[PDB]
């Protein structure tokens, strides 16, 4: 885009680094329903349910992945932080996580995207 | 006189902030109970009734928030919430992991319903 005032330049990249935050949460809320889906047919029909959260397990490292080049310590305490490193870090190099504490990270970057969000819109 | 155009305009944004609000106030107090309990485990239980009152103020969030449900969770994952949820009622203290996806998934729904609003 042409020839935009230093004001106008930070308005559009407030406005949009806003929407591609926002966008985020929804392909990625999208992607979870797709996977739900398919494991609820899945049990409509033994390993079907290991590789539907592999690739579940998969689409949550991505997203992560996303969400810190949007940018972490910012929104853990550290006991935490180091729980959270060592999931993203064990996903990272396509080893399969504790069930639960897998679980603790879908659940704690879904929650500090909606924070990053909330911290743009207020 | 405002319009009806006008005139829900200001509620629905009045609501945005009257939960936005309402959010950053229990964020705040989460914040406290962990400064709290970190400085409670620095020293040496203490630690304990920190742990247990901290449970009973998510408790109250997710009272707070069914007030104004299943429509953000799949069956399987709603009743592991609802037990939990009932576990608390009760004064029951839950294995911590089953409480921590309990308290992170009341903050998701939080978030989500704000944005219903805000978007």
Excluded: C
């Excluded at 809320?29 to 690739?55: I, P, S």
């Amino acid at each position: 885009v042409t020839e935009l005032s230093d004001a106008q330049k930070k308005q559009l990249k407030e406005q949009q680094e806003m929407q591609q935050m926002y966008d985020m949460i929804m392909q990625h809320k999208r992607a979870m329903q797709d996977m739900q889906l398919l494991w609820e047919k899945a049990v409509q029909q033994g390993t079907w349910e290991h590789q539907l959260r592999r690739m579940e397990m998969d689409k949550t490292r991505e997203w992560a992945e996303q969400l810190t080049k949007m940018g972490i310590g910012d929104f853990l305490p550290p006991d935490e932080l180091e729980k959270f490193m060592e999931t993203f870090k064990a996903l990272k190099e396509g080893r399969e996580p504790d069930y639960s504490e897998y679980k603790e990270f879908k659940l704690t970057v879904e929650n500090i995207g909606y924070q990053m969000l909330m911290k743009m819109g207020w």
